[PDB]
Symmetry: C2
Subunit: 374 residues, 2 copies
């Protein structure tokens, strides 16, 4: 009987310059490890994604995740430092993704036995909003903002990652999804990211000791969809949303076109919104207003990033002074891609980090169909 | 001056100079647990800080039960209590530092790790857990709250049980009900040590998820009966419902052991068949499936016993019969509602067992003759 090696460090095979230290936790599509890079004298995060081509939907999302990160350059966005050359260029079924390290992330933060001041909360929120503004002005809707992909440093700086679901302008966690996204509308805008921000803001507000003295009593605001094993999930999620912000008003339903959608919504019995000031009593009227404006059912009624950055609540932390090109992805987002095409693009992205890489000709024959504006 | 965040919370952990706090391990019962090094004995230990002790006297008495039981159990199968640190304020302490034997991991953590177990590992862990439960029961105790979080684990597959705060002598918070026997869900008073066997079946089911041939992606591992929500009458209904979804609704024979009102309640649940365990776990022999099946019996009398489980063909190759006790007496009677002043007295007497020179304040010692009688 072999000893158990709980962190799985032995499964992590990377070049000599990287010293694998320990398991950080779960990332999107794989596990993330702390490593020291001897060549650049810094700590990095190395994510191993396995079973890459088993599910081509996930595979394309992994590709989208790395192609976007490779093209965004901002202090508000996790840097992609390296894509490690696969041992087998023809048959690789895994990829090692090397990322800028952060001290923590919001998901981890909320589980820690520490408390935040209101200054911390405003600073984190303000930094998140700055990141989102950079994302949107780069022509991207993140579409899956959640505590797990808002990385955090000790100085409250925020770095966004995990762009696998992003739009050009498994049990899934639906707790941070806008109602219009839950209602399977294909007409939605960057305002879905503002909804997600409101959800994250609510959890940041749980970090005040005067609100919650016991860290184990901190919960997401809309935990409607089950953690455990599509229609029932979406229904349950909509249901908890309405429990918090009330059923939609007549003016809310006016903004929607499809009568099948309205009819479905009407099936939900009427209820009033809960009192947010009561839920978060240590927060000023302006703070409640900001949270309220982020969590509007009607996306046109939802506060914008510009407005939020201008909001009285954030006046004290705003740094107008210390504060963009639209990105072009090497594939069109509508194309369904074959495994052979996917393999080509992956290796091209690897080649951006390793120019001496010779991509096999069975893949390079696809070269004329991609990277048309690069 | 916005202070840097310090995510571990090592700052509020105040212990004598011989203990060097290294890092946060995670959540334990009623408090957070830290890895520490004891300079005096030159070994690593776990230190749990329990605070807000006397805010809720129900939790307070459970904390006391947890430490008094551990202090009186002596076994390689049971986490050792190494120290109870003297409070700074003998009169008004609202926190306690509890120093425990360190383990490498625990079953809850194991199930989240990116590693896989062989069948031999699984058999070995289960066998060791059963040995621990047998020692517990022979000591005159029903654990009553066995779950992966309190089954500690070392690399060699040795298992150490802890967290006896809900334990019974054999004569707010969101509560995890997923490992509770149906007669506990149904609030019956006449239950037996067989409730621990039900919990063991639940844990065994999650151990089986650790086989790569069952589940190749660690994120697809779930408890068997996740009925009660993560976020008292509704919870018990949902938990009982998921149990019947797995093992079917109870037969007429199952009900014979049972109050007419309770039987009337169970009948409200629409009839259903048990699922097929052989299909759910296709890599396990008929022996393993039989062991699991016989642990998860609705009727507690029909459940396999620990002796029968240790005799089972499934565990034959790991059994070390050759390597296989007094009933413990608690210093208070389980039934009595204790006042804060009485609770403080017993806490300090337990502290005194580790620190004989401690002088307990006279205002507490007046309660002497009511405790430690046996």
């Amino acid at each position: 009987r072999e000893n158990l090696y709980f962190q799985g460090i032995k499964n992590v095979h990377v070049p000599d310059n990287y010293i694998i230290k320990h398991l950080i936790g779960r990332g999107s599509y794989g596990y993330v490890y702390l490593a020291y890079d001897k060549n650049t004298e810094k700590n990095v995060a190395i994510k191993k994604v396995n079973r890459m081509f088993e599910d081509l939907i996930d595979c394309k999302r992994i590709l989208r995740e790395i192609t976007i990160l490779n093209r965004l350059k901002s202090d508000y966005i996790i840097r992609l430092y390296d894509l490690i050359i696969p041992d087998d260029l023809l048959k690789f079924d895994e990829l090692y993704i090397v990322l800028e390290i952060a001290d923590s992330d919001l998901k981890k933060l909320f589980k820690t036995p520490i408390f935040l001041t209101e200054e911390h909360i405003k600073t984190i929120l303000y930094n998140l909003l700055l990141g989102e503004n950079f994302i949107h002005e780069s022509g991207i809707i993140h579409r899956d903002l959640k505590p797990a992909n808002c990385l955090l440093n000790q100085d409250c700086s925020v770095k966004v990652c995990d762009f696998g679901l992003a739009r050009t302008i498994h049990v899934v966690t639906r707790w941070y999804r806008a109602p219009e996204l839950i209602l399977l509308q294909e007409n939605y805008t960057k305002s879905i990211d503002i909804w997600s921000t409101g959800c994250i803001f609510a959890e940041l507000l749980n970090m005040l000791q005067s609100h919650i003295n016991d860290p184990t009593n901190r919960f997401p605001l809309f935990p409607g969809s089950s953690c455990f094993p599509h229609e029932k999930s979406n229904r349950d999620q909509l249901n908890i949303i309405f429990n918090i912000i009330g059923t939609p008003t007549e003016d809310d339903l006016k903004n929607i076109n499809k009568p099948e959608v309205i009819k479905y919504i009407k099936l939900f019995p009427h209820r009033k919104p809960i009192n947010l000031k009561q839920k978060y009593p240590s927060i000023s009227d302006d703070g409640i207003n900001l949270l309220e404006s982020m969590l509007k059912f009607n996306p046109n009624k939802r506060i914008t990033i510009d407005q939020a950055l201008d909001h009285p609540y954030l006046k004290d932390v705003r740094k107008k002074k210390l504060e963009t090109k639209k990105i072009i992805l090497p594939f069109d987002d509508w194309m369904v891609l074959s495994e052979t095409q996917l393999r080509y693009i992956f290796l091209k992205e690897v080649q951006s980090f390793h120019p001496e890489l010779v991509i096999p000709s069975v893949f390079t024959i696809h070269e004329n169909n991609f990277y048309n504006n690069e």
